[PDB]
Design a protein around this ligand. Sequence first.
Ligand code: NA
Length: 129
Amino acid sequence: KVFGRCELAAAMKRHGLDNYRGYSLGNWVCAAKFESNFNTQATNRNTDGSTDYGILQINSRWWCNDGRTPGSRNLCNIPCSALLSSDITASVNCAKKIVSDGNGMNAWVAWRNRCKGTDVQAWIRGCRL
Ligand code: NA
């Protein structure tokens, strides 16, 4: 599924991401835009052989099991394919574990480079929330 901006904001709000660990909703919307262009089916392979999955590009080295990333952990205890669903619940739930891991939203390289320090409230402007 390719979300609209406000549709995703709403879904994220409903699933408790607004101000989760102090990160306002615009931060999560901005991260999703630049990580996946709001497409739940996005995948990208990394040099190390791991793959990033779904709207928040969650990596198979640590977070989910794809069956082809040797010695990886599966800290979210889910097949990576679950992260490609039109239902963002699994992605949101795993994201909450990641953002709690010590480095906050710096775990998302697109967030760090393209959202951090910018006016992220812009991402939710206009929306009915
Ligand atoms: Na894994």
